[PDB]
């Protein structure tokens, strides 16, 4: 399973949550920004590594990072 | 069930085709695997004898039949070795069989004993014996 980490540079624009095709990320309330919310990645074991979340993230460098790791049936996307 | 990854077509499910395929030695269930292996080996050896004796490097000499029969025997031996290796690597000893236990009607049936260590071993032994017998019978018939 891959590893998805959220850093504190986030501004809570909800784009990464919408972009995910496997329902990995979600948003929780926070107090470190104006939008008063941050992202989190509970269902990491479902991540397929498509890196769509990193494509839609406005920041000098991305506040959500995906590191590829040990592969498995779910993360590889095998239908058989 | 439409959502299963298969289709119902005239060729896939026909009375003649289903009857023919359900009578082949590899598809019987209540029969111990040794006899089915013997039959399969006999058929395969008798089929295999031909091309080696017909298109080999010694097809134009007087040594065509013996060389072809020996080549067919070697192929049968190699196939038996491959079958034994696959049986060792795939099935375990004490575990039950992994064959389906119900038919299209849904009526429960005894699982096939071929998908087991002892069953596959019997099948491979029968196949080896049948292949050798078929090869030698074809050699006897062709050049006598």
């Amino acid at each position: 399973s891959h590893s998805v980490k959220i850093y504190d540079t986030c501004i809570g624009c909800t784009q990464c949550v919408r972009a995910c095709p496997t329902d990995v990320l979600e948003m929780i309330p926070w107090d470190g920004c104006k939008a008063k919310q941050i992202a989190s990645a509970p269902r990491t074991e479902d991540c397929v590594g498509c890196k769509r979340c990193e494509s839609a993230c406005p920041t000098d460098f991305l506040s959500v990072r995906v590191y590829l790791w040990h592969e498995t049936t779910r993360s590889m996307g095998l239908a058989y | 069930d439409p959502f299963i990854g298969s289709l119902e077509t005239p060729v896939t499910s026909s009375p003649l085709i289903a009857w023919y395929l359900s009578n082949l030695p590899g598809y019987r269930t209540a029969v111990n695997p040794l006899l089915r292996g013997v039959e399969v080996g006999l058929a395969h050896g008798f089929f295999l004898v031909g091309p080696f004796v017909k298109a080999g490097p010694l097809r134009n000499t007087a040594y065509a039949g013996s060389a072809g029969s020996l080549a067919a025997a070697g192929l049968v031996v190699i196939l038996s070795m491959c079958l034994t290796i696959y049986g060792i690597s795939s099935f375990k000893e004490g575990e039950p069989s992994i064959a389906p236990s119900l038919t299209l009607t849904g009526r429960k049936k005894q699982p096939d004993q071929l998908q087991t260590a002892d069953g596959w071993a019997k099948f491979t032994g029968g196949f080896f014996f049948g292949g050798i017998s078929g090869v030698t019978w074809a050699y006897f018939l062709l050049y006598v």
């Binding site: 890196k51 769509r52 590829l68 592969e71 049936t73 | 598809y27």
Partner: protein, 733 residues
């Protein structure tokens, strides 16, 4: 922990077929194994070294035994110029009658293989004359392989296992390697040359049984200890000496004659013995520099810390470099690989102009094969040096402990170095291509006199300085009166000038307008390859497109399609790109050498001098002209002994063309194809009783790139080797 990759659980958990591939791929990478420590890594490295030594010794033993058993050494030593060496016998059930008839060469009773490795001349020179010596050597090397394996197993034991602090004792290792490994070995080889090789060259047979009852020099050891060493050079070998016999010989064992042996066109054995003696003395004297347990010597860390320039133009200088070098193994590997590559290139450049083996200048195919082989090995090693430097920068570099020293300053200003390398490569490529195309068009229109031909003035001046009088300059050794000519005239100049001023040999060949452009092309290739490798090494830690490259590792596929798309962004991809340029440059160099030497050997040097200035000359007068005999190995009319070379030609072509598969097409299409094939196999009758254990998946991206590169290299190497050997063997001149 359960499946085949016992050294990595992550590779054992996944059920696809990539587990096998990645288990085979990363077996020797001891840093990534789970539960690894420094001690285990060092001990595994030690055991691997021992195994490699055993393999090398077994290889040379097998070579010796096969030449002894299936060769014609005894018949070859009598008539060196009129007997073809035999490598080993051929047994093949697939061979037809004409193949058996055609391959029977030499004096054998069956098919054999002509040996182009050149071991016959080496073994003849070092003093072997019968097959008993070869059998004895084979047994000795078998014993050496056995003892190497035994030592490896012994040192893997718990009781004899060394500790980490032992491995990092740099000063003692340097002292012992400089004094014992180098100096003593050279001294022993000098002893062998004095005792066996030189007397064996004059007809006296010295062996183990009776080497105590013979005197290498009639005076003995008296002159050496007295001080009159000159007595060892009183009677040199006469100019009419015949190798292997006792006609017109002398008694000296250490000389400084210089030049080549007249009959064999090789270096004198006395000169070689003297050179080895001097080198051994120098190494023995120089090996006592560093401090050890006896309280005197030098300390390396204090040597490094003291070299900091006042004024701070270099910053902190060399402070902290000792620990950086010691604590990291990739730094050591990179340094060793760079040195080995330079040494290999030196060997390749020297062994063709100053041959040291008897009757090797008359064997053209052996010379060509040896030169090409050594140059390719040198290129690969030089690429590996930069690869391991980049790995070091990724893994073992600690920014805090190397603050403001030379490494930090290097990481500071990468942009200037990259820009200047790019400028130099652009300049060279632009102008070389322009000159070549202009010459080609001028020849195409039918007017050769409008060509651009530039004389290599500087190289010709260098050759004139060395003592060549074929141009007109009178500088240094060329001039009759000069401090250098007077200083060196009494010892070695009389032979050196005669050797260099002949036209047959390959020592300092004449050069004209054709060599200028080829040298500039070689420089362009070197600059471009260096640019690629240096950029990959310096941009490993990070850049502007991805400033956290050190977290993902040395090799990773990509970073998605975002930010415009980032393919081939890692340093592994920089190495994979630089391999192609290395191959291209080495190919250019080998083409130049082969064409120049074949034109020289064939008799006329005007063909090269008139057809090397435009590219159609290379395409028509080198490849097309010389492929005539190679492509005719087998035809509808028949076949001859060149059939195997044509077959390997086609084999190399096929492999090279197959590489394009993996180098062009990418993963998704093949994954979809595998999807469909899996459905087809699962849905068929009489074949669904068999089920797979590993789910079939397409190859990864980096794996596909590696496979394509391997195919490319194999095809390239095999095709060129076949062409070179067949073309040089067809005419034997």
């Amino acid at each position: 922990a359960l499946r085949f990759p016992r050294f990595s659980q992550g590779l054992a958990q996944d059920p696809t077929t990539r587990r096998i591939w990645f288990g085979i791929a990363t077996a020797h990478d001891f840093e990534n194994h789970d539960d690894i420590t420094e001690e285990r890594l060092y001990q595994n490295i030690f055991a691997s070294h021992f195994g490699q030594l055993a393999i090398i010794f077994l290889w040379t033993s097998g070579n010796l035994f096969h030449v002894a058993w299936q060769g014609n050494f005894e018949a070859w030593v009598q008539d060196p110029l009129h007997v073809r060496p035999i490598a080993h016998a051929i047994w093949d059930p697939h061979f037809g009658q004409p193949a058996v008839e055609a391959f029977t060469r030499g004096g054998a009773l069956g098919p054999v293989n002509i040996a182009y490795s050149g071991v016959y001349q080496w073994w003849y020179t070092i003093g072997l004359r019968t097959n008993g010596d070869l059998y004895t050597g084979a047994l000795f090397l078998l014993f050496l392989s056995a003892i190497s394996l035994i030592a490896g197993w012994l040192h893997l034991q718990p009781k004899w296992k060394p500790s980490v602090s032992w491995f990092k004792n740099a000063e003692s290792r340097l002292n012992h390697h400089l004094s014992g490994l180098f100096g003593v070995s050279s001294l022993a080889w000098t002893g062998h040359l004095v005792h066996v090789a030189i007397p064996g060259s004059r007809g006296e047979y010295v062996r183990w049984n009776n080497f105590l009852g013979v005197l290498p020099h009639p005076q003995g050891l008296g002159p050496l200890f007295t001080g009159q060493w000159n007595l060892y050079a009183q009677n040199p070998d006469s100019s009419s000496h015949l190798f292997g016999t006792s006609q017109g010989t002398g008694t000296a064992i250490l000389t400084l004659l210089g030049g080549f042996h007249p009959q064999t066109q090789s270096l004198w054995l006395t000169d070689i013995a003297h050179h080895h003696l001097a080198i051994a003395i120098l190494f023995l004297v120089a090996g006592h520099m560093y401090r050890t347990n006896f309280g005197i010597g030098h300390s390396i860390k204090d040597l490094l810390e003291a070299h900091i320039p006042p004024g701070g133009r270099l910053g902190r200088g060399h402070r902290g470099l000792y620990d950086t070098i010691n604590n990291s193994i990739h730094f050591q590997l990179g340094l060793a690989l760079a040195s080995l590559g330079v040494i290999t290139s030196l060997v390749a450049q020297h062994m063709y102009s100053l041959p040291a083996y008897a009757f090797i200048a008359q064997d053209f195919t052996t010379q060509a094969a040896l030169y090409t082989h050594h140059q390719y090995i040198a290129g690969f090693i030089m690429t590996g040096a930069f690869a391991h430097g980049a790995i070091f920068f990724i893994r073992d570099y600690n920014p805090e402990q190397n603050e403001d020293n030379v490494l930090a300053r290097m990481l500071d200003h990468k942009e200037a170095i990259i820009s200047h390398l790019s400028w130099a490569s652009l300049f060279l490529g632009f102008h070389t291509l322009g000159l070549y195309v202009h010459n080609d068009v001028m020849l195409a229109f039918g007017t050769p006199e409008k060509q651009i031909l530039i004389e290599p003035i500087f190289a010709q001046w260098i050759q004139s300085a060395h003592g060549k009088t074929s141009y007109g300059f009178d500088v240094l050794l060329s001039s009759t009166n000069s401090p250098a000519f007077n200083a060196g005239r009494s010892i070695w100049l009389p032979g050196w000038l005669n050797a260099i001023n002949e036209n047959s040999n390959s020592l300092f060949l004449t050069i004209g307008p054709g060599d200028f452009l080829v040298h500039h092309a070689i420089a362009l290739g070197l600059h471009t390859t260096t640019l690629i490798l240096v950029k990959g090494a310096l941009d490993a830690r990070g850049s502007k497109l991805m400033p956290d490259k050190k977290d993902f590792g040395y090799s990773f596929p990509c970073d998605g399609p975002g930010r415009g798309g980032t393919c081939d962004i890692s340093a592994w991809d920089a190495f994979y790109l630089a391999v192609f340029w290395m191959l291209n440059t080495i190919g250019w160099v080998t083409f130049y050498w082969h064409w120049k030497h074949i034109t020289l050997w064939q008799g006329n040097v005007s063909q090269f001098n008139e057809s090397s200035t435009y590219l159609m000359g290379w395409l028509r007068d080198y490849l097309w002209l010389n492929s005539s005999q190679l492509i005719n190995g087998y035809n509808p009319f028949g076949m001859n002994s060149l059939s195997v070379w044509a077959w390997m030609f086609l084999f190399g072509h096929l492999v090279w063309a197959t590489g394009f598969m993996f180098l062009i097409s990418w993963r998704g299409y093949w994954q979809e194809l595998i999807e469909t094939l899996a459905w087809a196999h699962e849905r068929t009758p009489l074949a669904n009783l068999i089920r797979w254990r590993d789910k079939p998946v397409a190859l990864s991206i980096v794996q596909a790139r590696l496979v394509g590169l391997a195919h490319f290299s194999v095809g390239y190497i095999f095709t060129y080797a076949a062409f070179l050997i067949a073309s040089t063997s067809g005419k034997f001149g």
